[PDB]
Design an enzyme around this catalytic site. Sequence first.
Site, short mmCIF file in Angstrom:
data_model
loop_
_atom_site.label_atom_id
_atom_site.label_comp_id
_atom_site.label_asym_id
_atom_site.label_seq_id
_atom_site.Cartn_x
_atom_site.Cartn_y
_atom_site.Cartn_z
N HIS A 226 1.83 9.12 1.65
CA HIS A 226 0.83 8.96 0.60
C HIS A 226 1.22 9.93 -0.50
O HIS A 226 1.64 11.05 -0.20
CB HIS A 226 -0.57 9.31 1.13
CG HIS A 226 -0.96 8.53 2.35
ND1 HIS A 226 -1.76 7.42 2.31
CD2 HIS A 226 -0.63 8.71 3.66
CE1 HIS A 226 -1.91 6.94 3.54
NE2 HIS A 226 -1.22 7.69 4.38
N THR B 181 -6.52 4.37 6.34
CA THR B 181 -6.48 3.08 5.69
C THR B 181 -7.35 2.12 6.47
O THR B 181 -7.45 2.24 7.70
CB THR B 181 -5.05 2.52 5.69
OG1 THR B 181 -4.52 2.56 7.03
CG2 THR B 181 -4.17 3.33 4.77
N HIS C 16 0.82 -1.20 0.00
CA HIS C 16 0.00 0.00 0.00
C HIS C 16 0.86 1.25 0.00
O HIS C 16 0.58 2.19 -0.75
CB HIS C 16 -0.94 0.01 1.22
CG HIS C 16 -1.73 -1.25 1.39
ND1 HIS C 16 -2.76 -1.60 0.55
CD2 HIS C 16 -1.65 -2.23 2.33
CE1 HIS C 16 -3.27 -2.76 0.95
NE2 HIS C 16 -2.61 -3.16 2.02
N1 LIG Z 1 -2.61 6.90 7.32
S1 LIG Z 1 -2.63 6.74 8.88
O1 LIG Z 1 -1.53 7.51 9.44
O2 LIG Z 1 -3.93 6.95 9.42
C1 LIG Z 1 -2.19 5.07 9.31
C2 LIG Z 1 -2.05 4.75 10.66
F1 LIG Z 1 -2.19 5.68 11.61
C3 LIG Z 1 -1.73 3.47 11.05
F2 LIG Z 1 -1.54 3.22 12.36
C4 LIG Z 1 -1.55 2.49 10.11
F3 LIG Z 1 -1.28 1.24 10.51
C5 LIG Z 1 -1.66 2.79 8.77
F4 LIG Z 1 -1.49 1.83 7.84
C6 LIG Z 1 -1.97 4.07 8.37
F5 LIG Z 1 -2.02 4.31 7.04
ZN LIG Z 2 -1.08 7.59 6.39
#
Ligand SMILES: NS(=O)(=O)c1c(F)c(F)c(F)c(F)c1F
Ligand SMILES: [Zn+2]
Length: 257
Positions: free
Chosen positions: A93, A196, A61
Amino acid sequence: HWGYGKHNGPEHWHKDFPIAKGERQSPVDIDTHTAKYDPSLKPLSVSYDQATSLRILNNGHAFNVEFDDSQDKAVLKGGPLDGTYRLIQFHFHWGSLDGQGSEHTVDKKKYAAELHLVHWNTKYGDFGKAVQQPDGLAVLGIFLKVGSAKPGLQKVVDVLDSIKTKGKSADFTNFDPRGLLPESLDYWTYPGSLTTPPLLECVTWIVLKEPISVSSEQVLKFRKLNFNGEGEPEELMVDNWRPAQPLKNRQIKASFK
Ligand SMILES: NS(=O)(=O)c1c(F)c(F)c(F)c(F)c1F
Ligand SMILES: [Zn+2]
Ligand SMILES: NS(=O)(=O)c1c(F)c(F)c(NS(=O)(=O)c2c(F)c(F)c(F)c(F)c2F)c(F)c1F
Ligand SMILES: OC[C@H]1O[C@@H](O)[C@H](O)[C@@H](O)[C@@H]1O
């Protein structure tokens, strides 16, 4: 089995993760004029001096840089946070082109990418318990715009050739995440979720106002990664961002007047 393509992307996630339509989903558009200064916010403390990075992983991802979180080595405190949150990983991202890629937007503006430094609340002992709590996580979000190179990003860029495909990992010791920060720590904050799957509503978001500048060449190397594993049909890892979700009954607070 979720992803970012037409057949398993953000508009499909609710079928397996019904909280996707919940009341505190992330990301959101940050309306800078409606955001309100909060003089109550305590000073924000990013204390990364003793960080121990371990490894970098292509998880199909994005790519994650993981840290030793067995002690209070790299922590976030202050601002909207009660207590101490320990850094566990960061990831990004990004888009297929410089005009998109961020998850949060600022007055509907999309940045080329967004960095997320993920922290868990030490009162809950481990990340897994923290994601059962409404204040389990704090994510520090930093926008990337394309201009001058970010020297502290280059070590990341240069290792990506060794984790091109899903499931590949590499050593990534002695990386200092302080090299990824902008000058100012002015921020917006609001309660939200993982962006995610499983989309859990555990996150205090702290989104820095100042973007970091990275070079076109740096972000182009992000875009050479693959979503797929070795020996599988190649699909470039691009546009791994969720679009803005409804704000609902939330307020965004600003740390700056
Ligand atoms: N985008 S995010 O910072 O919300 C986030 C997380 F916080 C998280 F703990 C994950 F395990 C993720 F894969 C993730 F993408
Ligand atoms: Zn993230
Ligand atoms: N709710 S979700 O995003 O998590 C999710 C999803 F939306 C799905 F649609 C599936 N279905 S799928 O069979 O995996 C499958 C794909 F995901 C594809 F992208 C594809 F191209 C296929 F041909 C295919 F068969 C799935 F399992 C899943 F969890
Ligand atoms: O009732 C007044 C209060 O309304 C809230 O929605 C705001 O967040 C506060 O800043 C304000 O003082």
